[PDB]
């Protein structure tokens, strides 16, 4: 429901 | 004001979750920082030209293992500084940071570790907060489990954050249940279970030590924030807390007037004082810090931009905003450190990257 990361 | 005079890369090219200088230093000695990520634990000397010398690192025999947080404090029986670490493994490592080697651990956690805090005034007295939903307070002197913190109304989803106030007489939770917990340690029973566990001693004795199971906060709110709270701060007898909505707020229990040590677990009022602005930071585990006189406030976003808050101001909404920025640091800015004496600033990156900023 939330992203840790914003990046691969 | 600050200026970029250094950044590096670990080798290891795995986020760097986490930064803390060390403030338990002595006269005059080298200001040392400490940088957790992948499964390792890496202390630097700052020296002038922006020089940031490596020291000894710390890399866990399982390679598995992934820190996530470490906090300084004193070694109570040799006196030295110790460094605390722990993350997905769900164990706190206690290293001797001039050897680098583990002197002892704690299991018991039901999973990862997400934040770890020494109490201010007592360098034994150990917190954490994981992703079982529990806080957990520990005796680092007598290797004592003091309290778990949870269960009836306790969090209902993984613990992010916590922090001491200034006089360690109470602790304040936050996490993915969108909820901020107090939890007051300086109750009867607490101060009891504390005195109790330096009193322990398992040579002398087959009795095992007894937990105190606090299973409720003593105020709890949902009225702040509408996502993850992965970071929560007291500043005084107020609060500053962020979640992944672009602001950190400051806030406090109940009306303006009612002093945080009235305030009933009943209470459903809360006082917004305050709101710090920014962009691009929607992820969650993100944190931000605050020098060592608690004038400035500093948090990186997810594209590798710097805010730095003055908060010398009579009132919240005044504060005005540096905005540092250096065309090469474009990752996730995951954690800053101020040095004690407030005139370097470091953040670290989600590429593994080390950024030094001078005042």
Redesign the interface.
């Known amino acids: 429901a939330?992203?840790?990361?914003?990046?691969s | 004001s600050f200026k970029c005079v250094n950044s590096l890369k670990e080798d290891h090219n795995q986020?760097l979750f986490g930064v803390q200088f060390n403030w338990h230093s002595k006269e005059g000695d080298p200001l040392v920082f400490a940088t957790v990520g992948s499964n390792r634990v890496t202390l630097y000397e700052c020296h002038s030209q922006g020089e940031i010398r490596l020291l000894q690192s710390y890399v866990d025999a399982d390679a598995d293992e992934n820190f996530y947080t470490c906090a300084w404090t004193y070694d109570s029986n040799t006196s030295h500084p110790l460094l605390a670490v722990a993350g997905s493994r769900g164990i706190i490592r206690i290293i001797n940071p001039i050897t680098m080697q583990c002197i002892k651990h704690y299991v018991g956690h039901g999973n990862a570790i997400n934040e770890l805090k020494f109490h201010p005034r007592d360098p034994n007295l150990l917190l954490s907060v994981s992703k079982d939903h529990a806080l957990r307070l520990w005796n680092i002197q007598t290797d004592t489990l003091v309290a778990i913190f949870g269960g009836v109304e306790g969090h209902r989803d993984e613990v992010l954050s916590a922090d001491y106030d200034l006089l360690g007489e109470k602790i304040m939770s936050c996490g993915?249940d969108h909820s901020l917990k107090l939890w007051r340690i300086n109750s009867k029973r607490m101060m009891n279970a504390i005195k109790e566990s330096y009193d322990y001693n398992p040579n002398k004795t087959n009795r095992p030590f007894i937990s105190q199971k606090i299973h409720f906060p003593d105020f709890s709110t949902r009225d702040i924030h509408r996502?993850?709270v992965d970071c929560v701060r007291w500043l005084g007898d107020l609060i500053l807390s962020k979640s992944?909505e672009n602001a950190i707020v400051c806030w406090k229990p109940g009306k303006m007037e009612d002093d945080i040590d009235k305030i009933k677990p009943s209470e459903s009022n809360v006082t917004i004082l305050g709101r710090f602005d920014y962009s691009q930071c929607?992820?969650?585990?993100m944190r931000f810090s605050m020098d060592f006189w608690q004038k400035m406030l500093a948090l990186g976003n997810?594209?590798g931009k710097l805010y730095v808050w003055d908060l010398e101001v009579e009132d919240p909404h005044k504060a005005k905003c540096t905005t540092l920025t250096h065309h090469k640091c474009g990752?996730?800015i995951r954690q800053t450190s101020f040095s004690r004496d407030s005139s370097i600033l470091i953040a670290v990156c989600?590429?593994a990257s080390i950024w030094r900023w001078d005042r």
């Open positions: 939330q992203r840790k990361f914003a990046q | 986020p993915m996502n993850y992944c929607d992820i969650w585990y997810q594209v990752a996730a989600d590429d």
